[PDB]
Amino acid sequence: QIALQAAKIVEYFGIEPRVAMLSYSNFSGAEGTPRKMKKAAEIARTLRPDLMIEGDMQADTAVNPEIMERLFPFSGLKGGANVLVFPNLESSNIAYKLIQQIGKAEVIGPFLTGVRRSANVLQRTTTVDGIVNSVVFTALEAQFIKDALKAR
């Protein structure tokens, strides 16, 4: 369900979503997180048959098309994933915070999805520019939701 919500959000920006269920194993399907991610990928593929959903895999395999093509050509995900789904809260939280801090790539969020109305919570360690970006995207989501409500 999280992958489907993220796919809808990505499709809102005119980008074809490619979903990867991250793990610490590469298509191993072993006990624990790998089996859960494999089942999640299967369920997501069943729910939205037209999507490019694959799992389980690791982050480098997911976000590098060359690695996936060279090592795992059997997988149905090609071109590199743009949606990443994490097995638990610690992994996603730590990964996104570390990418925000030590990486040179901008990170905007977190945005609360799955709620009826537009309502966002900023991280307590945010900056002024982070608040500006979050408010911009909250305004975007609020306008979208208001238009959808008015249409009905």
Complete DSSP assignment for 38-101? HHHHHHHHHH-TTSEEEEEE-HHHHH-HHHHHHH-TTSS--S--SEEE-SSHHHHHHHHHHHHH
* Touching a second copy, residues 5-34 (CB under 8 A): 22-30, 32-33
What's phi and psi for 124, nearest 5 deg? Answer: -65, -20
Nearer to a second copy, 71 or 145 (CB): 71
- Does 118 contact a second copy by CB under 8 A? no
Nearer to a second copy, 84 or 141 (CB): 84
Shortest CB 12 distance to ligand ACO, Å: 4
Residue 141 in contact with residue 109, Cβ under 8 Å?
no
Question: Considering CB distances under 5 to 8 angstroms, the limit depending on partner class, which of a second copy, ligand ACO, none binds residue 12?
Answer: ligand ACO
Question: Considering CB distances under 5 to 8 angstroms, the limit depending on partner class, which of ligand ACO, a second copy, none binds residue 87?
Answer: a second copy
| Binding footprint of ligand ACO, residue count (CB under 6 A) | 16
Shortest CA distance to 56 belongs to which of 86, 32, 79, 26? 26
- CA 23 – CA 101 distance, rounded (Å): 22
Residue 110 in contact with residue 84, Cβ under 8 Å?
no
- Does 72 contact a second copy by CB under 8 A? yes
- Does 56 contact ligand ACO by CB under 6 A? no
Residue in 74, 90, 104, 116 binding ligand ACO, rule: CB under 6 A? 116
